[PDB]
Design an enzyme around this catalytic site. Structure first.
Site, short mmCIF file in Angstrom:
data_model
loop_
_atom_site.label_atom_id
_atom_site.label_comp_id
_atom_site.label_asym_id
_atom_site.label_seq_id
_atom_site.Cartn_x
_atom_site.Cartn_y
_atom_site.Cartn_z
CG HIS A 143 -2.13 -1.02 0.83
ND1 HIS A 143 -3.39 -0.84 1.35
CD2 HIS A 143 -2.20 -2.14 0.10
CE1 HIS A 143 -4.19 -1.82 0.94
NE2 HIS A 143 -3.49 -2.60 0.15
CG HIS A 171 -3.34 -11.91 -3.23
ND1 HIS A 171 -4.43 -11.49 -3.95
CD2 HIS A 171 -2.98 -10.87 -2.44
CE1 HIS A 171 -4.74 -10.24 -3.58
NE2 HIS A 171 -3.81 -9.82 -2.72
C1 HEM Z 1 -5.67 -6.28 -8.06
C2 HEM Z 1 -4.83 -5.94 -7.06
C3 HEM Z 1 -5.13 -6.28 -5.64
C4 HEM Z 1 -6.25 -6.36 -4.99
C5 HEM Z 1 -7.61 -6.03 -5.51
C6 HEM Z 1 -5.94 -6.75 -3.62
C7 HEM Z 1 -6.88 -6.92 -2.60
C8 HEM Z 1 -6.53 -7.25 -1.27
C9 HEM Z 1 -7.44 -7.34 -0.18
C10 HEM Z 1 -8.94 -6.93 -0.24
C11 HEM Z 1 -6.74 -7.75 0.87
C12 HEM Z 1 -7.34 -7.98 2.26
C13 HEM Z 1 -7.18 -6.86 3.26
C14 HEM Z 1 -7.73 -7.39 4.59
O1 HEM Z 1 -8.94 -7.66 4.67
O2 HEM Z 1 -6.88 -7.60 5.48
C15 HEM Z 1 -5.41 -7.91 0.42
C16 HEM Z 1 -4.42 -8.56 1.17
C17 HEM Z 1 -3.11 -8.69 0.84
N1 HEM Z 1 -2.59 -8.33 -0.35
FE1 HEM Z 1 -3.59 -7.81 -1.96
N2 HEM Z 1 -4.73 -7.03 -3.55
C18 HEM Z 1 -4.12 -6.68 -4.67
C19 HEM Z 1 -2.76 -6.69 -5.02
C20 HEM Z 1 -1.72 -6.96 -4.11
C21 HEM Z 1 -0.30 -6.85 -4.43
C22 HEM Z 1 0.28 -6.25 -5.71
C23 HEM Z 1 0.38 -7.26 -3.34
C24 HEM Z 1 1.84 -7.43 -3.08
C25 HEM Z 1 2.79 -7.62 -3.94
C26 HEM Z 1 -0.56 -7.74 -2.40
C27 HEM Z 1 -0.28 -8.34 -1.20
C28 HEM Z 1 -1.22 -8.63 -0.23
C29 HEM Z 1 -0.98 -9.43 0.93
C30 HEM Z 1 0.37 -9.88 1.38
C31 HEM Z 1 -2.14 -9.38 1.66
C32 HEM Z 1 -2.42 -10.13 2.96
C33 HEM Z 1 -2.49 -9.29 4.22
C34 HEM Z 1 -2.45 -9.99 5.55
O3 HEM Z 1 -1.99 -11.14 5.62
O4 HEM Z 1 -2.73 -9.24 6.55
N3 HEM Z 1 -1.92 -7.62 -3.02
N4 HEM Z 1 -5.35 -7.71 -0.94
#
Ligand code: HEM
Ligand code: HEM
Ligand SMILES: [Cl-]
Ligand SMILES: [Cl-]
Ligand code: NA
Ligand code: NA
Lengths: 713, 713
Positions: free
Chosen positions: B77, B244
């Site tokens: 972010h 993810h």
């Molecule tokens: C189309 C792009 C993306 C969408 C729509 C998206 C959406 C989300 C959402 C909704 C969450 C959950 C937040 C929560 O409820 O805690 C999240 C979690 C996360 N995203 Fe993504 N994401 C995107 C791209 C990314 C990218 C580019 C990265 C990293 C390179 C990333 C890494 C993470 C990780 C590591 C989490 C897990 C957080 C946790 O374990 O607390 N995502 N994403």
């Protein structure tokens, strides 16, 4: 574009502490206005102004062939925004040329006045500020029309952006009282710190209160607003009747002809506004206030005709051509000249507020005395005009040029001249050691110097430790100053002073003003030693002690701090949250947000709180100068909750055990809540920050001790 | 308190040029972050970060006992706000800790992440910025979980207040498209400069476009927003699937349980927000996005399980416990671990936007190649993660510390190393005389150097005259650069360069980049001579020439000026008035209002306007360096009106005769209208200001010429 203010409109606003940066200033970092002004040929500027008074421009033709009246109004409006409550407003920064004041409805057509002055400003350039020029022009107007002024001082340096001033909460210009953002409550009580009756007015409504044309009721608003601008009855009458000896009002047709104020106007209007579709839109056809009154038979010459008319006629309620209430002399001949047509004459006319000077019983007595003794009138007016136009300039040491009056006036909070050698570095070291050997504690010394120095406000440059007025009425009895404790400290320092002065030769002596400040310096040094750090706090002697007879106690009342977050003090409970009041106090002290932050965190741990409250004292080594306030505030091992007794007091408890660690107010905890202030607190709460914290604290302490040291000049 | 913004909400805002003053900065004005960081023990910091990953705090317990997922999201972010349109956003300033980003709904619970880092921040203090720490922490999270990163550079200095970024016009968080302030029009066209689909989101809505759970249509938003953040299809799939591979989402109960975001929270929350009334409000009960998805069977370890799940199951639309749309694997066993309860297991789940990687035809091909060749996936993700987190850092010369990758990447706009002696003062004088003897005019020389240097933007530190990219595609063909004129200048300068370089010994040579800048300096000098003034323009050699193969043409397109008020250029007709665009360009050039003012007045009289337009050329001595722009703009003898053909062009006529004297645009005339800009113009249009004008001009000229000179380091 949606902004943080849109999303979180009640968040504390720190941007007021960061106006006036070197970024927005076009002049070089070394530009010194006083040095420029001292070389200005003031006599040549006054000659150019004099010539201007009768050189009419076609885009805004001069009434009676003379701009004097217009320029007097311009200068009285420049000065007239001043409020004694906070010192804000006034002519001292030339703020009439920026928003909002440049577009207030009471300032309509003063945009034409200021543009008439451009060729002069352009000619003399940086050597005369717009701020000084506005007032000078009003003086030259008066002089050109046969009135002898009391004098003039230069030194008002120009500013480059608007000040953030609270001018009221109304969202509509000129809104009548009783609306959802009414500035009145109770029996017509105007809210502090305001000093005008409607949003966008200088003082009062010239028709009468909320437009009701009753001179007796209007008099009440006159007296209340003028007192809020530091003027008493005599000065009020002198100023109003003085001003209205000259010129005229403008209301030749309906106000709906008048277009947008300058801030709303189109780019092609090049900074001007209030363009009028009525006939020629100017001169004979001008519309400004909507009133059409000409007070005297010689509007371009000083006279005593204002009072001759006021008392020589009875007055009838009538309407201007724009529909505004005003008054006309019953049965009178057409004796008043027309501004453009030498074959037309008019009856005497008055505003409701002019009639106040005859129908309010207290004003009537003064006005009669002025009518019978016009030399008294002329002297009152000249003194009042000086005060009006100088009231926010600060100590007389800031006054520049060859026309400064030599008479010292009580309202100036005068400081006697120093006529002996000052103490040197070795004397200052000797006195600091004597102060520390006397038994006065860090807490006492800090708290006393803080109390003396922190009355300063940069808005009108009043207050500060110079004068040692902390020892006099009323400062010595202010609750924030802890009167009984204060008297004990002052008694000890006065005995130190007596002993040191009695041992000197050569007439060297130290003032109590200087010793109060030096003793605070000793306290800060001792606090630093307590923490394991050797530092010297700078000190500059040269303060003098003023007497009780040189101190106007009523005028000093407005400097009483009813809220001083730096001492975790609040005299009562206010509508405004305490953190907002902290930021307001920091602005008045001229502090940036980093300076406010360091200073508050240091004062907490030095024992500066009023009443020895433990609120915010987040240290186990009180009277040691450390960063403990920040380190402990920021410790996520502590959880904070409001107390049941008082929502504005918070308990800090160990998160794991429930054990009570600290208590704090909103002023303490805002440093761990607000995102910008927390980022500041984090720098001073970091493990590498002890040296930086100490240095920065000493620098801001010293800045505060010196706020009124305009003699260091 | 009613403010100028409330009265005149469309007035131009200059306060964006005066953010980031020395007033708001707690560090000394000599603080040099790069020097502090170079002395940090980066290895020690990384050890502490490793330890932190599994040190769970009870106020925000770690999922699966490991904070790595939370931190990866935090870092993604921080970098994720970046827009290529203007370079604004990104991780480079640590703005996630200030409003509005600290309180965006997409950033919910990242407040807890940042707070977990406070003890490390505190321990290392000024030697590691928050901005660097957020990215470093993301790296360490990856490494802790078994993923080898491509590298890391420090050097992101902290900032101390929010940046003024246009994030959209909507007044409701997360507002779906088609509202009164819609950021979309036509066939789902997102307005420039925005790079996210709804106010408060990083890129796209995880449920699908405006909440419609269609993976094919979600793909389109993904591709468009990621392209607006400088990422192509391969990088996009790598980053989403990579991210993810770790952690989980949080949606354990209805969103109505979640309270105020950090900027709206009570003071006792001490800078945290989104306090939840659902069960324990944290850990197993957490609610962040409202979705409840856990992607892999090992959420705390790098795996190839993301694409094995994506392709190995068919997916069924379902709802999380908060009501949000998400997808669950048809017929799958409960193979995914629970974050807190060892006895609970879950079926595989996916977001709509994860399924986009399979159901969009172009992404499916990449995703399959990654599924079949996991080493390609790993390498792509590592490179993409590096780019994501460094894309706003600027040239490689800003990269600090011992983990900087040696590989030079195209997106860094690389500049070759200089490996020869530079020109000295005698050579510079010889080259300037040759340039002036060639016949190139002041207007040509100034225009060309302006065109070369003013592509810089401080938001991502891209652009500037280093590289001589003005000679390459696409800069050489930009309309604002006057391609035919530009070619003729460059041809003459290349012949000067060739002849100088061919006569040297010892390897000395001049780059075309340096000669373009030096020739501009000659033009300025010659203009001063034309006005009767000796002047010296500083010049610092050391620029190199980049190749076409080092210059990505598609990436360069975003630096094209479609509005440059400094050359009175506007490519077409825009919604935002041209003076707002001028201030925006000044901000990107890092100019204050006084600098913007002087620079624009000087460029006008030197002939820098595109197409040799006379608009704003208020001088009878074009190509002489004088203050004529201001003196003439401010002359009240001229009256201005918009023309009938074009409301955005104005004619200035003699007030007394009606004769046409000048024409100007809104960018010219704003200097005569806006009350703060006009006050600046007056300083430079005063009779005492010719020398000041010249000096201030040369200073700002030189500042612009050096904006990208981070090698002077
Ligand atoms: C189309 C792009 C993306 C969408 C729509 C998206 C959406 C989300 C959402 C909704 C969450 C959950 C937040 C929560 O409820 O805690 C999240 C979690 C996360 N995203 Fe993504 N994401 C995107 C791209 C990314 C990218 C580019 C990265 C990293 C390179 C990333 C890494 C993470 C990780 C590591 C989490 C897990 C957080 C946790 O374990 O607390 N995502 N994403
Ligand atoms: C109760 C206080 C006062 C009220 C309500 C008031 C009201 C006004 C109004 C409504 C006008 C007409 C503006 C226009 O239509 O052009 C004006 C004109 C003027 N006022 Fe006052 N006034 C007050 C006090 C003062 C003071 C203290 C002075 C200066 C000492 C001043 C000097 C003038 C002058 C010289 C003009 C004439 C302007 C011209 O000739 O263009 N007035 N006054
Ligand atoms: Cl003010
Ligand atoms: Cl930004
Ligand atoms: Na003031
Ligand atoms: Na950026």
């Amino acid at each position: 574009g949606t902004s943080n203010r849109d999303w979180w409109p009640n968040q504390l606003d720190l941007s007021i502490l960061h106006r006036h940066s070197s970024l927005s200033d076009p002049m070089g970092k070394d530009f010194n206005y006083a040095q420029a002004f001292e070389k200005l040929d003031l006599a040549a500027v006054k000659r150019d102004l004099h010539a201007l008074m009768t050189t009419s421009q076609d885009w805004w033709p001069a009434d009676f062939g003379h701009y004097g009246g217009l320029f007097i109004r311009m200068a009285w409006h420049s000065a007239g925004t001043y409020r004694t409550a906070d010192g804000r407003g006034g002519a001292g920064e030339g703020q009439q040329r920026f928003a909002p004041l440049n577009s207030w409805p009471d300032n309509a057509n003063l945009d034409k006045a200021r543009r008439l002055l451009w060729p002069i400003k352009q000619k003399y350039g940086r050597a005369i500020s717009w701020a000084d020029l506005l007032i000078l022009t009003g003086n030259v107007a008066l002089e050109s029309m046969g009135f002898k002024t009391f004098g003039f001082a230069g030194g008002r340096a120009d500013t480059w952006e608007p000040e953030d001033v609270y001018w009221g909460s109304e969202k509509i210009w000129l809104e009548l009282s009783g609306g959802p953002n009414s500035r009145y409550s109770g029996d017509r009580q105007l809210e502090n710190p305001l000093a005008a009756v409607q949003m966008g007015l200088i003082y009062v409504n010239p028709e009468g209160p909320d437009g009701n044309p009753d001179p007796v009721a209007a008099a009440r608003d006159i007296r209340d607003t003028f007192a809020r601008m530091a003027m008493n009855d005599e000065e009020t009458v002198a100023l109003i009747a003085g001003g209205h000896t000259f010129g005229k009002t403008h209301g030749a047709g309906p106000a709906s002809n008048v277009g947008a104020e300058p801030e709303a106007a189109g780019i092609e209007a090049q900074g001007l506004g209030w363009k009028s579709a009525y006939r020629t839109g100017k001169g004979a056809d001008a519309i400004t206030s909507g009133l059409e009154v000409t007070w005297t038979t010689t509007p371009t010459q000083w006279s005593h005709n204002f009072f001759e008319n006021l008392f020589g006629y009875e007055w009838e309620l009538t309407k201007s051509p724009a529909g505004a209430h005003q008054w006309v002399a019953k049965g009178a001949d057409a004796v008043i000249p027309d501004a453009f047509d030498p074959s037309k004459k008019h009856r005497p006319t008055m505003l409701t507020t002019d009639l106040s000077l005859r129908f309010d019983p207290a004003y009537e007595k003064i006005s009669r005395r002025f009518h019978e003794n016009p030399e008294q009138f002329a002297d009152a007016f000249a003194r009042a005009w000086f005060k009006l136009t100088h009231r926010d300039m600060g100590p007389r040491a800031r006054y520049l040029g060859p026309e400064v009056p030599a008479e010292v006036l009580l309202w100036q909070d005068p400081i006697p001249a120093v006529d002996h050698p000052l103490i040197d570095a070795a004397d200052a070291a000797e006195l600091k050691a004597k102060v520390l050997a006397s038994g006065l504690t860090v807490s006492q010394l800090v708290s006393t110097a803080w109390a003396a120095a922190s009355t300063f406000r940069g808005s009108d440059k009043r207050g500060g430790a110079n004068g040692a007025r902390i020892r006099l009425a009323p400062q010595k009895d202010w609750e924030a100053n802890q009167p009984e404790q204060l008297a004990a400290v002052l008694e000890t320092l006065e005995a130190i002073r007596t002993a040191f002065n009695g041992a000197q030769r050569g007439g060297k002596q130290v003032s109590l003003a200087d010793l109060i400040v030096l003793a605070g310096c000793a306290g800060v040094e001792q606090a630093a030693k307590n923490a394991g750090h050797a530092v010297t706090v700078p000190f500059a002697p040269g303060r003098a002690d003023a007497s009780q007879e040189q101190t106007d106690v009523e005028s000093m009342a407005v400097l009483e701090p009813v809220a001083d977050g730096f001492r975790n003090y609040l005299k009562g409970k206010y509508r405004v949250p305490a953190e907002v009041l902290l930021v307001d106090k920091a602005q008045l002290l001229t502090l940036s947000a980093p300076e406010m932050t360091v200073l508050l965190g240091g004062l907490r741990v030095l024992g500066a709180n009023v009443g020895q409250s433990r609120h915010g004292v987040f240290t186990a080594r009180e009277q040691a100068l450390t960063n403990d306030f920040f380190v402990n505030l920021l410790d996520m091992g502590t959880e904070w909750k409001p107390t049941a007794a008082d929502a504005d007091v918070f308990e800090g408890r160990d998160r794991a055990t429930g054990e009570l660690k600290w208590t704090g107010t909103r002023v303490d905890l805002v440093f761990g809540s607000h995102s910008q202030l927390r980022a500041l607190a984090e720098v001073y709460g970091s493990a590498d920050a002890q040296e930086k914290f100490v240095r920065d604290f000493v620098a801001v302490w010293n800045k505060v001790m010196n706020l009124d040291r305009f003699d260091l000049a």
